[PDB]
Design a protein around this nucleic acid. Structure first.
Ligand SMILES: [Mg+2]
Ligand SMILES: [Mg+2]
Ligand SMILES: [Mg+2]
Ligand SMILES: [Mg+2]
Ligand SMILES: [Mg+2]
Ligand SMILES: [Mg+2]
Ligand SMILES: [Mg+2]
Ligand SMILES: [Mg+2]
Ligand SMILES: [Mg+2]
Ligand SMILES: [Mg+2]
Ligand SMILES: [Mg+2]
Ligand SMILES: [Mg+2]
Lengths: 82, 205, 80, 155, 129, 123
RNA sequence: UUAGCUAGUAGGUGGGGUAACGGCUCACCUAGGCGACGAUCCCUAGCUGGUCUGAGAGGAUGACCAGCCACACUGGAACU
RNA sequence: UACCCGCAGAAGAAGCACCGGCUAACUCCGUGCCAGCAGCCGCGGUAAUACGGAGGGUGCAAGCGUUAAUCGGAAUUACUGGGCGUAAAGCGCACGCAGGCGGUUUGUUAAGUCAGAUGUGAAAUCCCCGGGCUCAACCUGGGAACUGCAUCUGAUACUGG
């Protein structure tokens, strides 16, 4: 079960979710296949806090990977805003 | 995490004026400079090589009001930076807010600078800061709060700013009590009575 | 284009299989002196045409017994 | 104009029929700050007299050292009876990193950037000798160029 | 027995320099002639000449400058009991570029400075200073 | 030696020996005084050094030194011991910690009080 | 201041067995296999990225974080 | 909640170690080889800057000391980088298997050696250039590094066959 998920990094109260494709049975911050991008919920509004690698996501999704709900939301908002 | 004891004992121990006092009066009249503090301050024993290195280090720390842990971090930062360790260390010590506020003259000494900076009465680029050791980037604007504009001590220090020699790299406007950090000093503007070379081999034993 | 190793055979007493010793020079990790090690491998062989001491070409293959995982390819020494 | 400083002072003894006879020895190094450095050793009953004697002893027996820019031309290794000395040129601004006796010798000579370590015995009288030996045997590219008859395309 | 003839060559230059001999003589070999050629191109020796056919002998003419030996220190690095090989990016610089390191590479026996620009690297035969 | 000799037998490292084996990598160890007495130092010292034979929590019986002026360590008293040898006492390789467990601080002590377990005077 | 170790042991044929190669297993055949480049036996020990220190080489170390391994009161076993 | 504003008043907030030398910092009183101190040398038997107290000073500071443990200094297991006549250290002497090493020329091989490329060397960490918590620790983008392994192609001076 290959999934593209958010791994929570960063200090407390300042998450730095890390978009990465991984086997669903692994830990949230455990082993993963390959890092894809990042997402910063802080959203400082002075510099971009999200950059995703859409072509690798396509290579995974169209091959049989799975998108989580937050990552799916990230895909639609990046496309509409850029 | 500060110094609260007598001010001029520090100036006495290294035997030179350390600018701790406001300078409204002569330091000689206020205190006897040629004597060391304490009951043995009459005697001037032969100071060894380690002693002179330590006195240099303690002299810099007491000019800038910085403790040993803070100062050791500055030295490691200075040694990591490309260039030369001695004037890199001095350059960080200049970029502290206490020094920049004091040098631009809104505070008579670093202690007024410390109150002014730490009492939220200093803005940098319009942002309120109360950390004494916040580095000042070039092209940053430091101004007094509108509440703090009507206090006697700040205007009092402006005259003493003229009483002493003006810094070339800080541009002040006492009409509205503001200043600008054009860029860092190059160690040619700073006093030559500080031998920064001894600092390197003290911390590089 | 196939991965192959050189060696010389040390025994052929066991039947349909031989033991070959791969020699190599390796720098000593600490003292920097080129020492020589030995890799004795058990090698399967049909028709038993490998004697004693003759140089031999061997290739890795699927496991064929408890200890054997290498097979003959060619031989380059004969008749002592 | 030239600099002079004292390495060490030691009290020595010579017993006689009456008892001990105490004396004082002085090791000093004298350098112009360019690469012309010498050392003087003197003996006297009094410390001022002993140090003075070493002062004139150092003004004579001066040597010349070819410096690149406040530093050594190349790594150098100076050996005396019990003292081994390794000095190598360092980058600008790194200052002097050496033992007690070597730092004084090096700083009066005029080397500002150097990494120097002392092996073997650390007796001041012998490490100063070893340091002087290294500053001698270190060479300059132009003297090497004339030495090899190959001009100065090496650097 | 005799097990490092290259060490013998280096020892003869060193002892001849110390004793202020005009020339040294020693049985010749191809690697010996190559190292002598390197020294001659580099300016450490006056001239070498090979004589004889069945038993060749290198007659080296040593070099002096004022009252001092031209070769300050000559020593062997790669030895029969310890072979030393260095890559391109790890070739040593004897005396910060004012000395030479004889290097046997695929193209030929040559100095570190010339080997570093040819981009070869190889065995480190000798240090000459 | 020779490189070949060193490959055959590498450089054996010097094994370090602790000065306080009964502590066994513990900063302090609790024990009970199995004998409390005074002993004379080796020359050129002369005194009545206060020491105690203590059996530790790991079964190591060892003598320890009672620092300071005045102690109330009777027999069977449970205390804490720490490293540190008394030079003029052969075998006394440990110091008793004052101010911990049953051992009491030195009275009328105004300097180096933390080294003797003396609370700050109420002044 | 551990010198010999090995009898399914080393290999071959054939049957069986496993998701899969294999003495994995059994019957037979040959007498082999490992070892001074340290087998066997004894003590200690989870391994690594890394961490600490050191100019470097190196020395110590494997707590937190991540990868792998192994265990689940002790010993053994299979079932789904 | 961070954060911002208003209030009142210096008001609620400094301790620890050390001062014989190594090592920065000295005098007095007590005591009198006792009490004690001590990391090393050592100090104390009537002027103790070394013990205990007190003034003075020094270092660090919401910490300061002590103990334990690791590396360093220790070139004091020396690969880099040590020694063996007398300081520790050349077997009493020799023969000799394994092993280590090997004169000189040509050819060939390409195992060591060297060059190039390719694939790997997880992320975090360490380092460089930046970014965000008001600074800092902290978090974080990219890069460098991980030059170690494996494969393919090539060179043949040296070593080996
Ligand atoms: Mg703090
Ligand atoms: Mg079978
Ligand atoms: Mg265990
Ligand atoms: Mg070291
Ligand atoms: Mg070491
Ligand atoms: Mg020795
Ligand atoms: Mg003897
Ligand atoms: Mg002897
Ligand atoms: Mg003999
Ligand atoms: Mg040969
Ligand atoms: Mg090859
Ligand atoms: Mg990595």
């Amino acid at each position: 079960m290959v999934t593209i998920r958010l791994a929570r990094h960063g200090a407390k109260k300042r998450p730095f979710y890390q978009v990465v494709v991984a086997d669903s049975r692994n830990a949230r911050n455990g082993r993963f296949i390959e890092r894809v991008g990042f997402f910063n919920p802080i959203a400082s509004e002075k510099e971009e806090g999200t950059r995703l690698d859409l072509d690798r996501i396509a290579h995974w999704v169209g091959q049989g990977a799975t998108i989580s709900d937050r990552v799916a939301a990230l895909i639609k908002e990046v496309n509409k805003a850029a | 995490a500060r110094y609260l004891g007598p001010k001029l004992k520090l100036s006495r121990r290294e035997g030179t004026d350390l600018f701790l006092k406001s300078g409204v009066r002569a330091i000689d009249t206020k205190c006897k400079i040629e004597q060391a503090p304490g009951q043995h301050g009459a005697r001037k024993p032969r100071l060894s090589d380690y002693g002179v290195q330590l006195r240099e280090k303690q002299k810099v720390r007491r000019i800038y009001g910085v403790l040993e842990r803070q100062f050791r971090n500055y030295y490691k930062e200075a040694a990591r930076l490309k260039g030369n360790t001695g004037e890199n260390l001095l350059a960080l010590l200049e970029g502290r807010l206490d020094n920049v506020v004091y040098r631009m003259g809104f505070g008579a000494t670093r202690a007024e600078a410390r109150q002014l900076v730490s009492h939220k009465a200093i803005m940098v680029n319009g942002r309120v800061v109360n950390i004494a050791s916040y580095q000042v980037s070039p092209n940053d604007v430091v101004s007094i709060r509108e509440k703090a504009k009507k206090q006697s001590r700040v205007k009092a220090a402006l005259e003493l700013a003229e009483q002493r020699e003006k810094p070339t790299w800080l541009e002040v406007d006492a009409g509205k009590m503001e200043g600008t950090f054009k860029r860092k000093p190059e160690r040619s503007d700073l006093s030559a009575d500080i031998n920064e070379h001894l600092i390197v081999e003290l911390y590089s034993k | 284009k196939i991965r192959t190793l050189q060696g010389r055979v040390v025994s052929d007493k066991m039947e349909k299989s031989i033991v070959v010793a791969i020699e190599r020079f390796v720098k000593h990790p600490i003292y920097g002196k080129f020492i020589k090690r030995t890799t004795k491998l058990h090698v399967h062989d049909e028709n038993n045409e490998c004697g004693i001491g003759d140089v031999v070409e061997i290739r890795e293959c699927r496991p064929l017994s408890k200890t054997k995982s290498w097979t003959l390819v060619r031989v380059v020494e004969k008749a002592v | 104009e030239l600099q002079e400083k004292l390495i060490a002072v030691n009290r020595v003894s010579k017993t006689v029929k009456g008892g001990r006879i105490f004396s004082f020895t002085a090791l000093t190094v004298v350098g112009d700050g360019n690469g012309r450095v010498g050392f003087g050793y003197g003996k006297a009953r009094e410390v001022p007299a002993a140090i003075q004697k070493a002062m004139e002893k150092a003004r004579r027996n001066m040597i010349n050292v070819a410096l690149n820019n406040g530093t050594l031309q190349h790594p150098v290794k100076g050996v005396h009876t019990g003292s081994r000395v390794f000095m190598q040129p360092a980058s600008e601004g790194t200052g002097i990193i050496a033992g007690g006796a070597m730092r004084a010798v090096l700083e009066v000579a005029g080397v500002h950037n150097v990494l120097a370590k002392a092996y073997g015995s650390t007796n001041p009288i012998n490490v100063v000798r070893a340091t002087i030996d290294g500053l001698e045997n270190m060479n300059s590219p132009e003297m090497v160029a004339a030495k090899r008859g190959k001009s100065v395309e090496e650097i | 027995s005799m097990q490092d003839p290259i060490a013998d060559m280096l020892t003869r230059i060193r002892n001849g320099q110390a004793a202020n001999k005009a020339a040294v003589t020693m049985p010749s070999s191809k690697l010996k002639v190559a190292i002598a050629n390197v020294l001659k191109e580099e300016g450490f020796i006056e001239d070498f000449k090979v004589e004889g056919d069945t038993k060749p002998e290198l007659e080296l003419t040593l070099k002096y400058f004022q009252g001092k030996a031209v070769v300050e220190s000559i020593q062997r690095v790669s030895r029969p009991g310890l072979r030393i090989y260095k890559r391109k990016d790890e070739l040593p610089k004897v005396m910060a570029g004012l000395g030479i390191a004889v290097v046997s590479t695929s193209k030929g026996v040559m100095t570190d400075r010339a080997a570093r620009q040819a981009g070869l690297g190889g065995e480190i035969i000798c240090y000459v200073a | 030696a020779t490189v070949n000799q060193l490959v055959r037998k590498p450089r054996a490292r010097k094994v370090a020996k602790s000065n306080v084996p009964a502590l066994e990598a513990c900063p302090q160890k609790r024990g009970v005084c199995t004998r409390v007495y005074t002993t004379t130092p080796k020359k050129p010292n002369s005194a009545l050094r206060k020491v105690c034979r203590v059996r530790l929590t790991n079964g190591f019986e060892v003598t320890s030194y009672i620092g300071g002026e005045g102690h109330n360590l009777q027999e069977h008293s449970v205390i804490l011991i720490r490293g540190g040898r008394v030079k003029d006492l052969p075998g006394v390789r440990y110091h008793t910690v004052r101010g911990a467990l049953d051992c009491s601080g030195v009275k009328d002590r105004k300097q180096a009080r933390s080294k003797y377990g003396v609370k700050r005077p109420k002044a």
